[PDB]
Structure 1
Amino acid sequence: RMKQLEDKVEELLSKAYHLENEVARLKKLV
């Protein structure tokens, strides 16, 4: 079951990295 855990955390890392970008983007638009 460590395979499902690893694929979920890969998805969450990409989520986090994309949210990080949108936070940095949104910071410059205010």
Structure 2
Amino acid sequence: MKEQLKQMDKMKEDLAKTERIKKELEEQNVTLLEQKNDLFGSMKQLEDKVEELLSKNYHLENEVARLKKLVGER
């Protein structure tokens, strides 16, 4: 019966360790989900930015081309 109290003593520290690590992982898990979400939010902003710049790029190409003719270039 004495060894059990001991076997239990060790077991208590193992459970305590495993539990604390389980809690760290839960927190980590929560941080990752919120980080993936942040990246989705950032990509949506960049995609719209790319859209906007693309329109500006196409508009600018049309201006240059028109002005190229007007001045007799290339």
Unaligned runs of 5+ in 1: none
Unaligned runs of 5+ in 2: 1-42
Structure 1 position 16, deviation (Å)? 0.3
Question: 2:59 matched to 1:15?
Answer: no
Alignment identity in percent?
97
SS at match of 1:6: helix
Higher relative contact order (CA 8 A, sep 6+): 2
Structure 1 position 7, deviation (Å)? 0.2
Runs of 4+ off more than 2 Å: none
Compute the RMSD of aligned alpha carbons: 0.3
Structure 1 position 20, deviation (Å)? 0.3
TM-score by length of 1: 0.90
SS at match of 2:55: helix
Structure 1 position 11, deviation (Å)? 0.2
The count of aligned residue pairs is 29
Deviation sequence 1:1-30 (CA, Å, 0-9, x none): x00000000000000000000010000111
